[PDB]
Amino acid sequence: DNIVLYYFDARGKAELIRLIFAYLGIEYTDKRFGVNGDAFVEFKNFKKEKDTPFEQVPILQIGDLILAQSQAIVRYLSKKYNICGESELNEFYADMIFCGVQDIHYKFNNTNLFKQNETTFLNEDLPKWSGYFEKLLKKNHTNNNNDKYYFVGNNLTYADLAVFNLYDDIETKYPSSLKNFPLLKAHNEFISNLPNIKNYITNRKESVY
Amino acid sequence: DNIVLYYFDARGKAELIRLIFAYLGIEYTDKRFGVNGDAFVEFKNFKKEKDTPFEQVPILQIGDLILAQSQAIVRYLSKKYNICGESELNEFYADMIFCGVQDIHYKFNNTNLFKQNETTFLNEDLPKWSGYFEKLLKKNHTNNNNDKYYFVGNNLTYADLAVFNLYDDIETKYPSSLKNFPLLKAHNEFISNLPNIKNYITNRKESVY
Ligand SMILES: CCCCCCSC[C@H](NC(=O)CC[C@H]([NH3+])C(=O)O)C(=O)NCC(=O)O
Ligand SMILES: CCCCCCSC[C@H](NC(=O)CC[C@H]([NH3+])C(=O)O)C(=O)NCC(=O)O
């Protein structure tokens, strides 16, 4: 019943978990390797002290329970705290959308810092994937038109937070990315303004990734 | 004419070229996109005004001559200014070493920052590749012992500078990485203390990569 999240000092694959905790107002210890200096030694000492299944982070520890694999952690958390949808179909859709997010998020990460194929990403990959998500929001649109935007049903799911996080990452590095996608831009403003998320984000230190 | 080097605000693909210019004492303009605001917009405006063969940087402009492709630029510069060996065979060896540096450099860049496969990089690939270079260094032993270390022949080549740049970069992240490779470490210290290089490095700005 004591909750601790371990990861490096970065958003990366731990950020959606932090967002979920913030949304749900669950208190926990956000352990970031390297805050005490020397990320290498901490992570090394961490693998000695804790029984990780694949020697990787994020690791979420609940009391004595070691949980690994960010995706599995996200899905487990979401079922326990009721943001995994209201039906079996919607649970699937939230899941499907989260997997879609992983596809572009991966590409975004591979291009933003190194500028690797930045032009191809910004001209082909990004608008195509943003178009996919725009169309999903649209298919779910008259599930609350009153400035509430959800990808799945009439309630918030981890998919909303996952898409938020993704486009939160993208519009900062690439301002006005959302301008051609009105539903997606609105969705990003909506969830970003939810008080718990609004407070987490303003309190959130800047980071390289 | 005026030499202008065009790249993003980073070491990456341009640094070796800058090291060659520093080493040779060649004056040029080091134009860096995105020093002040969003590199992608500046790069976009650059391609509109400049005819590049592949719409990518680095670009080296000498007069109205436009040169693209970092590796080809290095070789051209190195042949022009006599740091490419002194026999057809040593010219090949410098080239071979450079290509080897690119294999390991790519791995270091792909795993540093994100930590994707860090322990694989650290316990397998880096030591392996460090051993390759150490071994190549030993093979050039007769090409003196007199506190001078070269990979090829008995004069500095761009391969020396490439290997330097490779471990200068790695040593930032993993500072003890050359403790088991004393000849490689001495090599690295020797290059870094050449007056033109020492000077360029002290004055060099810090970067994420
Ligand atoms: C933008 C984020 C992309 C970067 C991915 C790297 S996350 C850090 C890395 N862990 C993983 O790759 C975990 C992947 C796993 N599939 C998950 O989702 O948790 C690690 O423990 N690294 C330490 C090591 O391998 O030694
Ligand atoms: C760790 C450093 C390695 C990062 C690789 C990307 S360097 C920037 C990129 N250019 C290239 O990929 C050039 C590759 C070419 N083979 C070279 O070596 O010059 C670019 O112009 N990008 C802009 C664009 O595609 O729009």
From Swiss-Prot, chains A, B:
Signal peptide (residue range): none
Gene Ontology MF terms in the entry: glutathione transferase activity
Enzyme class, broadest EC rank: transferase
Effect of C99A: 2-fold decrease in substrate affinity
Occurrences of domain GST N-terminal (ranges): 1-85
Start and end residues of each GST C-terminal domain: 87-209
Entry keyword Signal: no
InterPro entries: Glutathione-S-Trfase_C-like (IPR010987), Glutathione-S-Trfase_C_sf (IPR036282), Glutathione_S-Trfase (IPR040079), Glutathione_S-Trfase_N (IPR004045), GST_C (IPR004046), GST_superfamily (IPR050213), Thioredoxin-like_sf (IPR036249)
Activity regulation information from UniProt: Inhibited by chloroquine, cibacron blue, ferriprotoporphyrin IX (hemin) and S-hexylglutathione.
Reactions catalysed, as given in the entry: RX + glutathione = an S-substituted glutathione + a halide anion + H(+)
Binding of glutathione, residues: Q56, V57, Q69, S70, D103, K115, T119
PROSITE patterns the record matches: GST_CTER, GST_NTER
Pfam families tied to this protein: GST_C_3, GST_N
UniProt keyword list: Transferase
Domain of life: Eukaryota
Family that this chain belongs to: Belongs to the GST superfamily.
Physiological role: Conjugation of reduced glutathione to a wide number of exogenous and endogenous hydrophobic electrophiles. May also function as a storage protein or ligandin for parasitotoxic ferriprotoporphyrin IX (hemin).
Subunit structure: Homodimer. In the absence of ligands two homodimers may interact to form a tetramer.
Protein's name according to its UniProt entry: Glutathione S-transferase
Organism, scientific name: Plasmodium falciparum (isolate 3D7)
Source taxonomy: Eukaryota, Sar, Alveolata, Apicomplexa, Aconoidasida
